[PDB]
Tab-separated table of C-alpha atoms in Angstrom:
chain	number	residue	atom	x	y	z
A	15	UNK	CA	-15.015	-16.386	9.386
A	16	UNK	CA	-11.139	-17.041	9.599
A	17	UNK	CA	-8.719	-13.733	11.502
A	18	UNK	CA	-5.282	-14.934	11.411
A	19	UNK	CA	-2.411	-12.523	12.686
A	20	UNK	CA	1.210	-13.084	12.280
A	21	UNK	CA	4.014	-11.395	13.532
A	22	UNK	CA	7.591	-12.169	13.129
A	23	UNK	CA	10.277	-10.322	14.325
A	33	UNK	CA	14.994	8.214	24.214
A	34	UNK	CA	11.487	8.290	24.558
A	35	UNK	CA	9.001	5.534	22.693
A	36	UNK	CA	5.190	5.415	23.844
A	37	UNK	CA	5.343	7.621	26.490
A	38	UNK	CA	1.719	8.524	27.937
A	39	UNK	CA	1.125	11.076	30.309
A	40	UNK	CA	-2.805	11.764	30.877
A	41	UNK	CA	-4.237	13.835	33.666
A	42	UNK	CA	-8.169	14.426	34.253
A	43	UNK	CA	-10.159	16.137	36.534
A	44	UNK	CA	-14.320	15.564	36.594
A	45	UNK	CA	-16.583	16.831	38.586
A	46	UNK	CA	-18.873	14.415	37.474
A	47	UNK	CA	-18.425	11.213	35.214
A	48	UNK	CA	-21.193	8.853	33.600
A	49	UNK	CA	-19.824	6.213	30.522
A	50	UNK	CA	-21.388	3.717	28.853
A	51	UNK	CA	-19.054	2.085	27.283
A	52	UNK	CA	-20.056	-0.538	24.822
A	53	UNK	CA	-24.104	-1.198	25.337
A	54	UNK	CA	-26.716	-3.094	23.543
A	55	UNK	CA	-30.332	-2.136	24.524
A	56	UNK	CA	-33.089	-3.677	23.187
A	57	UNK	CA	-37.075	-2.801	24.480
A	58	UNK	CA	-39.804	-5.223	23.044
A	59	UNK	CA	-37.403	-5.757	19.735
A	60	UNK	CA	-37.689	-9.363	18.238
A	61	UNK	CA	-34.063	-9.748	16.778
A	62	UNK	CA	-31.042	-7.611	17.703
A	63	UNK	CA	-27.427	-8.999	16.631
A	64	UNK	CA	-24.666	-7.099	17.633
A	65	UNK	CA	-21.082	-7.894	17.299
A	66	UNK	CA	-18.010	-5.610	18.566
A	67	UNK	CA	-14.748	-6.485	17.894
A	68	UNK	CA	-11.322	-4.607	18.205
A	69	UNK	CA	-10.787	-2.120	20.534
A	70	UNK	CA	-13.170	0.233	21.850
A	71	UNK	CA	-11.869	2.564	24.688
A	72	UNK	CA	-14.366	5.318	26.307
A	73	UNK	CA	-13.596	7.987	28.642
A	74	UNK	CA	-14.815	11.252	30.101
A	75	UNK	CA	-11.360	11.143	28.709
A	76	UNK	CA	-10.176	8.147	26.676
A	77	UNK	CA	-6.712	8.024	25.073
A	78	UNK	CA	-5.231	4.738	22.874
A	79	UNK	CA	-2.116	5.103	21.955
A	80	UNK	CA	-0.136	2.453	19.650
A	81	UNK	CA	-3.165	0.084	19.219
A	82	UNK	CA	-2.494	-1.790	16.981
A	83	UNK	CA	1.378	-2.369	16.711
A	84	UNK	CA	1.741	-5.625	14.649
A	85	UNK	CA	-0.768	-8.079	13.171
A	86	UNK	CA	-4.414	-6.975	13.987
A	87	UNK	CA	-7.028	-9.208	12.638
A	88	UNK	CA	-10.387	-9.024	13.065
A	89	UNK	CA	-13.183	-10.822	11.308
A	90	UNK	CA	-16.254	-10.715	11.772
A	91	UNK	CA	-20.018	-12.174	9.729
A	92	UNK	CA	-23.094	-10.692	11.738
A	93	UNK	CA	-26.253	-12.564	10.075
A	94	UNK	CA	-29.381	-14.165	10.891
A	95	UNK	CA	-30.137	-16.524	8.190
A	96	UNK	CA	-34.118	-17.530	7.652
B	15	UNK	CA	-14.939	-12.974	5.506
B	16	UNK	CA	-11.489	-13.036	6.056
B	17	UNK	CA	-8.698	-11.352	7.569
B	18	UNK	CA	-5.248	-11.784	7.210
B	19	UNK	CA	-2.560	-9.190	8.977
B	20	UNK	CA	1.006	-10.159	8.320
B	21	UNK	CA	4.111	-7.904	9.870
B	22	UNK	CA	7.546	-9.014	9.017
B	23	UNK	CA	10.825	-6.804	11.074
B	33	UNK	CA	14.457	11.625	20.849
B	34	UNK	CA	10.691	11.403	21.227
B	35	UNK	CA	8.249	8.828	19.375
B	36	UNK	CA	4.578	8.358	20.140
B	37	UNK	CA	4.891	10.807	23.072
B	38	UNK	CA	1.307	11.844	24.904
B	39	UNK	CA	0.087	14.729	26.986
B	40	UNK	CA	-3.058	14.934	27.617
B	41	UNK	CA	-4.887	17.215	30.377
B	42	UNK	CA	-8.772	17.384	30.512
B	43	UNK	CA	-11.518	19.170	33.319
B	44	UNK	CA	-15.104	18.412	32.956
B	45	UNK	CA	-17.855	19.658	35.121
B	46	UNK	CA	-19.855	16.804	33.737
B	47	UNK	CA	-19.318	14.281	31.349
B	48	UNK	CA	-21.973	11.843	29.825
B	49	UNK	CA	-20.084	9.483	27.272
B	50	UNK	CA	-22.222	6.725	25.590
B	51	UNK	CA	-18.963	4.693	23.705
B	52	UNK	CA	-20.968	2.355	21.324
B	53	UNK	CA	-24.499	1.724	21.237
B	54	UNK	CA	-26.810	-0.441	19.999
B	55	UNK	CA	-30.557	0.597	20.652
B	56	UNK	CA	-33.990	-0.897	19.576
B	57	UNK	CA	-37.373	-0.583	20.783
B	58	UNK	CA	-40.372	-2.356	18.838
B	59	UNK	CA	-37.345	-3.360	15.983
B	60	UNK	CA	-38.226	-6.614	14.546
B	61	UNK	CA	-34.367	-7.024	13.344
B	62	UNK	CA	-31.006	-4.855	13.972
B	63	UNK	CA	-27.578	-6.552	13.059
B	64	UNK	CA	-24.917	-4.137	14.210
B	65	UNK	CA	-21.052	-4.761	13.782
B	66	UNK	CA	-18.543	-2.609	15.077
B	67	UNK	CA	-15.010	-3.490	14.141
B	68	UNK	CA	-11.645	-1.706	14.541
B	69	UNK	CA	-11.109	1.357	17.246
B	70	UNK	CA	-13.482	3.344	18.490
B	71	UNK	CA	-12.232	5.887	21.204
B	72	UNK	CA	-15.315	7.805	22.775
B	73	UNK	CA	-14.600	10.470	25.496
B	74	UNK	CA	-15.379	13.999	26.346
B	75	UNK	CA	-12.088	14.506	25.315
B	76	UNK	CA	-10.580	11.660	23.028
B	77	UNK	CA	-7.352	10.960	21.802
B	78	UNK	CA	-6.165	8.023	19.394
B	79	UNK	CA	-2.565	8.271	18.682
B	80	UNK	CA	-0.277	5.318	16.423
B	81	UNK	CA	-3.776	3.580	16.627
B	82	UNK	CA	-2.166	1.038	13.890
B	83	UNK	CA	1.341	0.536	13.166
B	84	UNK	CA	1.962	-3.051	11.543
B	85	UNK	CA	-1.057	-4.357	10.241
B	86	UNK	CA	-4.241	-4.064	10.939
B	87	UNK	CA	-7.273	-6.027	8.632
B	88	UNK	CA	-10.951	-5.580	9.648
B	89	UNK	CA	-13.365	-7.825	7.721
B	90	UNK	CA	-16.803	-7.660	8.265
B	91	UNK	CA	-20.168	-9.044	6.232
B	92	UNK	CA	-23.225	-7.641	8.305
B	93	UNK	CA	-26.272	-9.609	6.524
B	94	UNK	CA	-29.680	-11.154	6.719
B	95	UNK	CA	-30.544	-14.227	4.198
B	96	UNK	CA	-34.313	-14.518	3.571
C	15	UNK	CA	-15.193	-10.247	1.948
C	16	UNK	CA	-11.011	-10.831	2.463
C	17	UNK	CA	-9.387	-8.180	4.040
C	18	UNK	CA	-5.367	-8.741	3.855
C	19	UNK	CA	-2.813	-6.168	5.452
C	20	UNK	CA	1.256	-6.803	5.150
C	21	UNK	CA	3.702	-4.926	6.687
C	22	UNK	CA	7.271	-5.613	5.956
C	23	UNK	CA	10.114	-3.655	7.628
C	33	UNK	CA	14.305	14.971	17.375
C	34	UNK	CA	10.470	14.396	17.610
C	35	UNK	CA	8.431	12.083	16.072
C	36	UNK	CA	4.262	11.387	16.610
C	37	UNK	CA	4.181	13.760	19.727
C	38	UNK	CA	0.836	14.981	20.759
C	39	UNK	CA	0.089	17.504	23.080
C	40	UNK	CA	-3.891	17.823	24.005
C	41	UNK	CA	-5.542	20.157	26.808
C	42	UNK	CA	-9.305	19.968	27.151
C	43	UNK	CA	-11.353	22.182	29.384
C	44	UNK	CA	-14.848	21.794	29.219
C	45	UNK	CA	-17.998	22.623	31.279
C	46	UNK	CA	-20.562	19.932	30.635
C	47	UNK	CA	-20.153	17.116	28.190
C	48	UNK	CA	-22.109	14.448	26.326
C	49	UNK	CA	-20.846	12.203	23.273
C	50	UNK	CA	-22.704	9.125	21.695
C	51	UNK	CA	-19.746	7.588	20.159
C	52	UNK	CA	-21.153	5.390	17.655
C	53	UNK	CA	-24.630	4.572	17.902
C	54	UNK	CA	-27.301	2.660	15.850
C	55	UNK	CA	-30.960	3.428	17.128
C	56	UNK	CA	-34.219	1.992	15.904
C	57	UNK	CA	-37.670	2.609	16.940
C	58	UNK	CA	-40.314	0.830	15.060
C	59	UNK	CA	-38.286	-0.803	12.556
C	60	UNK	CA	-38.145	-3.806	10.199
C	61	UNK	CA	-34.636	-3.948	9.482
C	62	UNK	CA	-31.732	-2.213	10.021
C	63	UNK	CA	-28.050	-3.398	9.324
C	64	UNK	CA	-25.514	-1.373	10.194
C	65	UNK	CA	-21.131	-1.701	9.931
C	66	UNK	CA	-18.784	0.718	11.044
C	67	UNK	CA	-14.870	-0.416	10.286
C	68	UNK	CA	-12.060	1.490	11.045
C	69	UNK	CA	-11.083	3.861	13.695
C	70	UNK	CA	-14.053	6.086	14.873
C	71	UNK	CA	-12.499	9.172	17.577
C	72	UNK	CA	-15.781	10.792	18.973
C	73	UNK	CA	-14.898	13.586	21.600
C	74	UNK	CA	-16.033	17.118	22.581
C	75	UNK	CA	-11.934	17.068	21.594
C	76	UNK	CA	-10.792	14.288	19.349
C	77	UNK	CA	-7.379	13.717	18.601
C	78	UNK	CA	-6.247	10.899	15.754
C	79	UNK	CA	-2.627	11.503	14.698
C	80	UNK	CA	-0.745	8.681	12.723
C	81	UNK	CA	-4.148	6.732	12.448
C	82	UNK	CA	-2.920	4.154	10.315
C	83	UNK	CA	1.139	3.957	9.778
C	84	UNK	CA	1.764	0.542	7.848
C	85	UNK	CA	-0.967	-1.259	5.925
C	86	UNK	CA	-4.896	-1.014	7.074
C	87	UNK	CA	-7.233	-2.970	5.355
C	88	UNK	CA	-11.198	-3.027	5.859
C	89	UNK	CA	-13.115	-4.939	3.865
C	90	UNK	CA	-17.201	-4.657	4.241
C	91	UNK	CA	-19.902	-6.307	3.488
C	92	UNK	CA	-23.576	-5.298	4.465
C	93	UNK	CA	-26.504	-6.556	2.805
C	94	UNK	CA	-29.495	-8.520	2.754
C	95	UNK	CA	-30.410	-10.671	0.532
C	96	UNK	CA	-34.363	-11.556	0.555
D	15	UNK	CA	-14.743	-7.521	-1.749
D	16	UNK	CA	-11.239	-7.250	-1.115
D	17	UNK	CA	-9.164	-4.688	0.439
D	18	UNK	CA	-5.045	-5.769	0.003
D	19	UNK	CA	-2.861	-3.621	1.553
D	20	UNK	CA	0.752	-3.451	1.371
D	21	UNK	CA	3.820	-1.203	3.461
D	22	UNK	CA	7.413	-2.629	2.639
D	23	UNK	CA	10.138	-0.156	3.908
D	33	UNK	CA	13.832	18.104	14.069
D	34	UNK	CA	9.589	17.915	14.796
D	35	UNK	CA	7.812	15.788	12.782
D	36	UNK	CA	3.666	14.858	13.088
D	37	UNK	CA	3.639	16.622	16.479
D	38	UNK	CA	0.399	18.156	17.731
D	39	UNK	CA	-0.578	21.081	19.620
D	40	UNK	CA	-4.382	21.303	20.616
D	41	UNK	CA	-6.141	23.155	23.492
D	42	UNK	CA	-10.322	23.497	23.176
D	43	UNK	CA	-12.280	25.231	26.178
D	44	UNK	CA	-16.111	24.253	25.595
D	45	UNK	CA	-18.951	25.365	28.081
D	46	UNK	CA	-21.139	22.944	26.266
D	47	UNK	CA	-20.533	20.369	24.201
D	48	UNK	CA	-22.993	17.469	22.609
D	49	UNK	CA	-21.015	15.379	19.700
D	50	UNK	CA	-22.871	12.659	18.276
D	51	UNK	CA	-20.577	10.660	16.146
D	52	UNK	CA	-20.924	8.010	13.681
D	53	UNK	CA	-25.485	7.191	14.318
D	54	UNK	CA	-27.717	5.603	12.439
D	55	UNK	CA	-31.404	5.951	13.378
D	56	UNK	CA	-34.629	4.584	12.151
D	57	UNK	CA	-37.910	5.588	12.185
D	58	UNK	CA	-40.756	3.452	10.803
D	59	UNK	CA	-38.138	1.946	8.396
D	60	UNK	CA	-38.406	-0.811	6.583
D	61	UNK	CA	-34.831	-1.253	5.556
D	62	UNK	CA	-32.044	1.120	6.022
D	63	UNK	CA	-27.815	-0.379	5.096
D	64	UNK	CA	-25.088	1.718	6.708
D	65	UNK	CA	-21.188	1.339	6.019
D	66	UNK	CA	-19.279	3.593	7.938
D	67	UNK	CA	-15.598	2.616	6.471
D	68	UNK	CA	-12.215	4.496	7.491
D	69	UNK	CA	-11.837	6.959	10.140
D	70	UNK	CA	-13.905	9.315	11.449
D	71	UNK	CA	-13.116	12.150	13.921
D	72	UNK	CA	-16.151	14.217	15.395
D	73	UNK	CA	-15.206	16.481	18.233
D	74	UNK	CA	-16.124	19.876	19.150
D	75	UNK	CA	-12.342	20.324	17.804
D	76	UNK	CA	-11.522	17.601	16.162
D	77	UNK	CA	-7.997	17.229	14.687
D	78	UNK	CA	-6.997	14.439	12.342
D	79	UNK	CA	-3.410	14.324	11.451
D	80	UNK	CA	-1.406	11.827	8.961
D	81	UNK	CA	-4.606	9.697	9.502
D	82	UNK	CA	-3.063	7.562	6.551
D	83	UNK	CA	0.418	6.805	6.530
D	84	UNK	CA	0.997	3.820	4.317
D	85	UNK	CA	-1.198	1.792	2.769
D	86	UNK	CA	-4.909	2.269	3.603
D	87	UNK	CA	-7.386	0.207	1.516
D	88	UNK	CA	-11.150	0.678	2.161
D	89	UNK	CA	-13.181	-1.674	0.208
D	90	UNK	CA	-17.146	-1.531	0.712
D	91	UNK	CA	-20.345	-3.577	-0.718
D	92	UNK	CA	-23.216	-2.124	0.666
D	93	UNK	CA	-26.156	-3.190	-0.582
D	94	UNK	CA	-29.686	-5.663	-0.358
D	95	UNK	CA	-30.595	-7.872	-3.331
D	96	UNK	CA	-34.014	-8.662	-3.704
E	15	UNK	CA	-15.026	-19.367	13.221
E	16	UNK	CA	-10.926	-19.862	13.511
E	17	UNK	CA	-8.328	-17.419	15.002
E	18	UNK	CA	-4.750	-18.014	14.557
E	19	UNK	CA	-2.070	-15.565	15.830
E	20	UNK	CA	1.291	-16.636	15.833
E	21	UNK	CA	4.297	-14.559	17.008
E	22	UNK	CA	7.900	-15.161	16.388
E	23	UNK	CA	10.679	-13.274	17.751
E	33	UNK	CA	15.492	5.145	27.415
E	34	UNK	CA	11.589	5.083	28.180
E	35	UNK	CA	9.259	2.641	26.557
E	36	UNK	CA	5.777	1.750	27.316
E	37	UNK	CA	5.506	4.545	29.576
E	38	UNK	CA	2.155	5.400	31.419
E	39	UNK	CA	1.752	8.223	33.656
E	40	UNK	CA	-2.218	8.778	34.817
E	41	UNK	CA	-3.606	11.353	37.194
E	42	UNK	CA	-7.599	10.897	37.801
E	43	UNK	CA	-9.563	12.635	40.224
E	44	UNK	CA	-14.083	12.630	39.811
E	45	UNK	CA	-16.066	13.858	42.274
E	46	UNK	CA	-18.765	11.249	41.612
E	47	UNK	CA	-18.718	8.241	38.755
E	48	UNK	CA	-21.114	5.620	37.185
E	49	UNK	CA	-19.268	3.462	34.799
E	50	UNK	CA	-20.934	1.063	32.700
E	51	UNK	CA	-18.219	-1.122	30.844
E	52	UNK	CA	-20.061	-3.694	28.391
E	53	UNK	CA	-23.202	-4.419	29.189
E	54	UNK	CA	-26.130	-6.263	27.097
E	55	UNK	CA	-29.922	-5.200	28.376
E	56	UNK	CA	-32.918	-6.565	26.734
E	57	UNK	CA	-36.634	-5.774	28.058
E	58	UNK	CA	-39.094	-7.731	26.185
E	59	UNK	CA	-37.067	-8.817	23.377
E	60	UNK	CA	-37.566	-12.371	22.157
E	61	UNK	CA	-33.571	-12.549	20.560
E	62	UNK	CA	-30.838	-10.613	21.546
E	63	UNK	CA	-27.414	-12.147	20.567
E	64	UNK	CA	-24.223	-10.444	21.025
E	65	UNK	CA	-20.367	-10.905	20.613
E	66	UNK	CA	-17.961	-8.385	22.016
E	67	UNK	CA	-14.328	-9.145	21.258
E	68	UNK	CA	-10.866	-7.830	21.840
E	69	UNK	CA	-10.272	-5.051	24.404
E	70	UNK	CA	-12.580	-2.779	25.843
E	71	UNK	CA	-11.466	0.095	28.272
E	72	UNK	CA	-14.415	1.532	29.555
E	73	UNK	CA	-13.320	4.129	32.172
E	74	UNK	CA	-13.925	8.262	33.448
E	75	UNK	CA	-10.766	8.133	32.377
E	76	UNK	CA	-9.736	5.729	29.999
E	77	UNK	CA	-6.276	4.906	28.746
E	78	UNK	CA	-5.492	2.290	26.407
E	79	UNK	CA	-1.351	1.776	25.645
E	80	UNK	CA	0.183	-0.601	23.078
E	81	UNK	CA	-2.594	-2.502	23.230
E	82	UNK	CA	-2.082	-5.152	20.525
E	83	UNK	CA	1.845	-5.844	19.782
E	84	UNK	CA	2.369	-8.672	18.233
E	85	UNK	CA	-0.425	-10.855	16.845
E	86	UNK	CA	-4.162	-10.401	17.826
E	87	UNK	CA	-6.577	-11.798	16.039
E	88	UNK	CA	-10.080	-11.941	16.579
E	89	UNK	CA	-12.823	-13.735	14.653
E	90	UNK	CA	-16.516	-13.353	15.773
E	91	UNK	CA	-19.573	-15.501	13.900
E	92	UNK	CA	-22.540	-13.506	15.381
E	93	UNK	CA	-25.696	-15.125	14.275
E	94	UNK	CA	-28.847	-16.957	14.199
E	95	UNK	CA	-29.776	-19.342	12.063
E	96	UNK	CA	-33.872	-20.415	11.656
């Protein structure tokens, strides 16, 4: 499992964000497991969550993401 | 499972966002089991969850998700 | 699995969003299992989930997912 | 599996969006199981789910997707 | 499991955010297991988890992440 990144090397990503909630519940990223023998999970990159969620521009040069999720038996 | 990203070098990538909720429930990612004897999740790149969601530019330059997700029996 | 991405290098990408809602619930990206053997599951790329989603200019320059997802028994 | 991509290198891409939802339930990118014995999932690329969902110039440049999905028995 | 990111080298970066929730639960990452004799999980790279989320320029220059996610019996 090899990821390798390599970079070489007026308005410009200008964020303007307002929210109003009443009420907010997020989760975000969640693994749940009840009486479950095995659970593999992997997340990888970016994961943004919100009532509101904004990504701007990520990814600007080398992303690189590798990932093997396996149970082996 | 590999992943190479290679990058060699007015308005631009501007935002406006504006949200209201009353109520927000967001659950982003999720993994659940109950009584599962196996679950291999992989989540790779960007996920943006949100009552409201925005994903601007998410890549610019490279961007390489690899991913093998597997059980051997 | 080889994923390889190579980049080699007035209004422009300008995103206006207004969201107004009520109530709000979003799973995002979810795997659920109840009473299950196996389940393998890969999500790769860029996943918006929103009562308002939003991608502009998802990928600009190279992207590359590779995926795998098996078992072998 | 291999996914190879390559980039070598007024109002333009702008966005306008306004959604007003009482209610709003967005579920996403989901897998569920029941009583399964197997189930594979590859969710490659992006995916936008919104009550309004708006994708624009998701692909700008080179976007390779390459998928195996599948159990060998 | 090897990650290598290597880097070689008006308004920019920007971020204006307005929030305001009457009431918020936020859950960020979070692993739960009730009665589960394996759980194993990897989350990489950058999470936001927020009622209002905002993720700018996350990745410029390299990132790479690699993630081996499994069990072995």
């Amino acid at each position: 499992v090899v990821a390798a990144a390599e970079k070489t090397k007026t308005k410009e990503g200008v964020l303007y964000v307002g929210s109003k909630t009443k009420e907010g519940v997020v989760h975000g990223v969640a693994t749940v497991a009840e009486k479950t023998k095995e659970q593999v999970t992997n997340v990888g990159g970016a994961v943004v969550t919100g009532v509101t969620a904004v990504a701007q521009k990520t990814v600007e040069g080398a992303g690189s993401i590798a990932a093997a999720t396996g149970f082996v038996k």
